[PDB]
Design an enzyme around this catalytic site. Structure first.
Site, short mmCIF file in Angstrom:
data_model
loop_
_atom_site.label_atom_id
_atom_site.label_comp_id
_atom_site.label_asym_id
_atom_site.label_seq_id
_atom_site.Cartn_x
_atom_site.Cartn_y
_atom_site.Cartn_z
N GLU A 85 0.82 -1.22 0.00
CA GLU A 85 0.00 0.00 0.00
C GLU A 85 0.85 1.26 0.00
O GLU A 85 1.89 1.34 0.66
CB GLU A 85 -0.96 0.00 1.21
CG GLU A 85 -2.03 1.14 1.17
CD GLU A 85 -2.96 1.02 -0.03
OE1 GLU A 85 -3.97 0.27 0.03
OE2 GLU A 85 -2.68 1.67 -1.05
N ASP B 22 -2.33 -5.20 0.77
CA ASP B 22 -1.69 -4.11 1.46
C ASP B 22 -0.27 -4.43 1.97
O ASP B 22 0.58 -3.56 1.99
CB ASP B 22 -2.54 -3.69 2.64
CG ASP B 22 -3.81 -3.01 2.21
OD1 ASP B 22 -3.71 -2.18 1.29
OD2 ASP B 22 -4.88 -3.31 2.77
MN LIG Z 1 -6.84 -2.44 2.45
MN LIG Z 2 -4.76 -1.65 -0.51
#
Ligand SMILES: [Mn+2]
Ligand SMILES: [Mn+2]
Length: 181
Positions: A65, A93
């Protein structure tokens, strides 16, 4: 009673690097933070949670992320080549080098179990781990496995609580809570 602006709040509350990455995410999606400002706040919040999660255990996680989408997929594909991990359908993420799995972090103002089930339905993965936090302390994770210990997660929850109380203090919580999805 005064009603503050969410942009003022975000720029005053979040780290400059987090704000800049959030602006970049919005630009990359062509979103205008000046109009979608609750979304701006939610993006910053999600970024910060992902960073705190990784920081809870130095060296254990790769962060996905925050990166530009092309670089994000570059990193994902490299991790998959190196570790033998199955390629996710959507960008996750984090990657957990200890448990050997990608992680999707959710942060929600909605009911966490419903949010979890929706996330699980979206990513279609037998492998990706999902961990959902709310702003009021509730959480839900894949197979009741919370990955980090109670103290680390308490640090994240306290942060979410602080954000919510700061918002409410500026009259911004009502709209932020109601604007999701
Ligand atoms: Mn997420
Ligand atoms: Mn994400």
């Amino acid at each position: 009673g005064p009603l503050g602006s969410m942009e003022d709040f975000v720029r005053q509350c979040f780290n400059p690097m987090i704000v800049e990455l959030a602006e970049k995410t919005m630009k990359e999606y062509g979103e205008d933070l000046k109009i979608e400002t609750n979304k701006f706040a939610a993006i910053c919040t999600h970024l910060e949670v992902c960073f705190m999660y990784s920081d809870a255990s130095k060296h254990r996680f790769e962060i996905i992320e925050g990166r530009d989408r092309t670089m994000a997929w570059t990193v994902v594909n490299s991790i998959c080549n190196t570790t033998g991990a199955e390629k996710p359908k959507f960008l996750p993420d984090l990657y957990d080098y200890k448990e050997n799995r990608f992680i999707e972090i959710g942060v929600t103002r909605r009911e966490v179990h419903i949010y979890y089930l929706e996330k699980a339905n979206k990513i279609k993965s037998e492998k990706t781990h999902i961990h959902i936090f709310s702003f009021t302390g509730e959480e839900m994770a894949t197979k009741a496995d919370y990955t980090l210990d109670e103290e680390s997660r308490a640090r994240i929850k306290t942060r979410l609580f602080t954000i919510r109380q700061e918002m409410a203090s500026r009259g911004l919580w009502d709209s932020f809570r109601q604007s999701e999805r």
